[PDB]
Design an enzyme around this catalytic site. Structure first.
Site, PDB file in Angstrom:
ATOM      1  CE  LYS A   1      90.732  56.988 -46.187  1.00 16.38           C
ATOM      2  NZ  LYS A   1      89.327  57.049 -46.774  1.00 16.38           N
TER       3      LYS A   1
ATOM      4  CB  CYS B   1      89.179  46.008 -47.540  1.00 12.25           C
ATOM      5  SG  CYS B   1      88.946  44.300 -46.973  1.00 12.25           S
TER       6      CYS B   1
END
Ligand SMILES: Cc1cc2nc3c(=O)[nH]c(=O)nc-3n(C[C@H](O)[C@H](O)[C@H](O)COP(=O)(O)O)c2cc1C
Ligand SMILES: Cc1cc2nc3c(=O)[nH]c(=O)nc-3n(C[C@H](O)[C@H](O)[C@H](O)COP(=O)(O)O)c2cc1C
Ligand SMILES: CC(C)(C)c1ccc(CCc2c(C(=O)O)[nH]c(=O)[nH]c2=O)cc1
Ligand SMILES: CC(C)(C)c1ccc(CCc2c(C(=O)O)[nH]c(=O)[nH]c2=O)cc1
Lengths: 313, 313
Positions: free
Chosen positions: B44, B131
């Protein structure tokens, strides 16, 4: 009970219409759309001069949707202007005319000519903002400075209420920026969300080949693939453009899908892929199905639920 | 007849792995993925500090796919680094570690510390370019100057071959620019296409409600909705980045979907929504299905058809 509504100073028997490009290219097409149960119709996006479009195969559909790189085939602006001016029966339903000139100047020159027919007959302009920037630059709606310029120039040139056809966005910052740009223009009275999801690629496993010939098989996606994207865009623009209408377009195959568009904020609901696939019969079905969901929930009007999608907490 | 592959100086029994975020958050998850018949696994996407993530419901799945706004829940970098250096059994299969720092500086500090473990154990880095940016700006990969900034600093701080996880693009000019940026960085040896299709909106008709709680129900789309988009992005990058590998991700439910990814140019093939829905048994099914397609076509290895999608003329 009936699905009648009023907007942009026109009356509509129901909120359904074709999506630009589908069943709307030729006089036969437009006559067929007029004879349908749809509440309105929109002409194929046009250019000043006629275009043949791209080599075939250029459209293909599948159980989950469609892919197309048509290349803006159209009969030319003189043709749709004449349809609007002399042929369309405005007693049957409203008409929208879509334009997608290949430059700002070409669009300005078409809207100046459209203006007096808009005044006289009430045809409504949908400006296609997937029209090209230039090769080398993203389509105009993905370049916010060029978008502001097109809208400045078209508003000046046209001087009457119009709407815009938007590509989908995928990023919240882009919703904020796109919508702020649009809200700089009081004459932009409706925003149609969305155009096809750009440059997907369908591959056939058996033949190991792409399925359309232009652009090495890349083209815009419609249909079931794009429903949540379409709902997100309608709702994002509905939230951000409280003084405009939002027209929903994308992944409509049932009255249920239409119901979700309206919950998201749609005033009108456009039907592309599903109309291309099923034909104009689809409109009677969609009306019946939307009225059935309404009856079961106890809703008497579209106004009672438009834009009332619930959030959690 | 073989699913084996050798890339990035590692050997893989088959091209399948989980998509980052699925079945890879906890030690239990990662041991489960290792025990599975996948050819690899990825952790993850992590931040320096552990995160709880967004409030629930934050993921939902349906026949045509999934929507999520998880908010990067994760055990923190130190945990995934420890799993890589001390807990993972590299005799079983290779490990990727995904990172998704909230600023360039946070990413730099994690890769500095990952580097010696990557060198010693051979853990492979996948840097998540969705991100989040400074808020009110688009995600990092939709902001080409932020993306360039991130890859320069990560290249410098890390100094070893790594890959990047890319959001989908929808516009050819965007393909061209993004690949050009990636091509400035020789250490970027693989490009994973694609992350979730951003900010869709799923509405439940019965309850008239969005289905996830964060962001007024807006979230990323995975699954059947996104296969053509994922194939377009795989092939666009495969063609524009001849010196890099492309990993495919998006809409894989079957050996056939995997086949299309590989025809499009995929090396590794990741599985998100369908894995979250079906569980790790999916990997045996996928392998058998892909081998069946290969036997019917007379293909003995993946390289015989990787990237060999046919165009029309
Ligand atoms: C064959 C075809 C032609 C199209 N032509 C146009 C067009 O000329 N102008 C336009 O704004 N959108 C055009 N579109 C986009 C549709 O108007 C619509 O936005 C899109 O198909 C998504 O809706 P759907 O999911 O119902 O197909 C076209 C779509 C198709 C499938
Ligand atoms: C619940 C969930 C969590 C995810 N978390 C991450 C993540 O941490 N990092 C990342 O790069 N992508 C993440 N993704 C994106 C997946 O890696 C994948 O790119 C996307 O779901 C599309 O693949 P699919 O269509 O097989 O789902 C996540 C997706 C899901 C559904
Ligand atoms: C001149 C060229 C760059 C080839 C071009 C200009 C404008 C358009 C837009 C027309 C359109 C088309 C199309 O006619 O290919 N398909 C859609 O799904 N949406 C659209 O908006 C499509 C193609
Ligand atoms: C929900 C929001 C705060 C907008 C956010 C934070 C962090 C990320 C990156 C992690 C990630 C996630 C996630 O953790 O929500 N989901 C994806 O489908 N792909 C991803 O790359 C994605 C999204």
């Amino acid at each position: 009970m009936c699905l009648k509504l009023n907007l942009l100073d026109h009356v509509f028997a129901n909120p359904f219409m074709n999506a630009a490009g589908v069943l709307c290219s030729t006089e036969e097409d437009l006559r067929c759309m007029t004879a349908s149960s749809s509440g309105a119709l929109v002409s194929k996006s046009c250019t000043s001069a006629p275009r043949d479009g791209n080599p075939e195969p250029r459209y293909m559909a599948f159980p989950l949707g469609s892919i197309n790189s048509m290349g803006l085939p159209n009969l030319g602006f003189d043709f749709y202007l004449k349809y609007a001016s002399d042929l369309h029966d405005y007693s049957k339903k409203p008409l929208f005319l879509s334009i997608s000139g290949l430059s700002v100047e070409e669009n300005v020159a078409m809207v100046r000519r459209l203006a007096p027919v808009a005044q006289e007959k009430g045809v409504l302009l949908e400006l296609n903002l997937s029209c090209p920037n230039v090769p080398g630059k993203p389509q105009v709606a993905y370049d916010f400075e060029a978008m502001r310029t097109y809208l400045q120039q078209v508003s000046l040139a046209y001087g009457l209420p119009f709407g815009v056809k938007m590509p989908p966005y995928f990023d919240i910052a882009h919703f904020d920026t796109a919508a702020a740009v649009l809200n700089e223009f009081p004459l932009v009275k409706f925003v149609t969300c969305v155009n096809s999801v750009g440059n997907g690629l369908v591959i056939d496993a058996e033949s190991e080949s792409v399925v359309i010939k232009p652009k090495q098989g890349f083209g815009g996606l419609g249909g079931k693939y794009i429903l949540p994207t379409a709902l997100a865009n309608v709702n994002a623009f509905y939230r951000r453009c409280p003084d405009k209408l939002v027209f929903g377009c994308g992944g409509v195959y049932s009255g249920e899908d239409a119901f979700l568009h309206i919950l998201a904020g749609a005033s009108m609901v456009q039907v592309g892929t599903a109309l291309q696939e099923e034909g104009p019969g689809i409109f009677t079905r969609l009306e019946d199905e939307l009225l059935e969901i309404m009856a079961r929930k106890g809703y008497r009007t579209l106004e009672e639920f438009r834009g009332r999608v619930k959030t959690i907490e």
